[PDB]
Amino acid sequence: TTQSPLNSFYATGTAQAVQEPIDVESHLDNTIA
């Protein structure tokens, strides 16, 4: 004679974010002379 609560069910996922939106690189190779 056991009474159960009937709520022992689960499901699991994951998420992440490990980088910045943009990357910037420079090529200014001229001199104001």
Binding site: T2, Q3, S4
Partner: protein, 58 residues
């Protein structure tokens, strides 16, 4: 069908006569059950008992 038994009205009275006594010596009666179980209740090895009593014979 001779009687219907339930948990609210457990008792009934039936009559067996010349037509029922086939093979002149025996009566055959099967049992039919309708039920709804309680929510979230678990159990095993539970007996169901029926009783017979004679009121008059001729």
């Amino acid at each position: 069908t001779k009687a219907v038994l339930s948990l609210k009205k457990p008792s009934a009275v039936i009559i067996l006569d010349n037509d029922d006594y086939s093979s002149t010596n025996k009566i055959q009666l099967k049992v039919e059950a309708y039920y709804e179980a309680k929510e979230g209740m678990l159990f095993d090895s539970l007996p169901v008992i029926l009783n017979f009593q004679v009121l008059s014979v001729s």
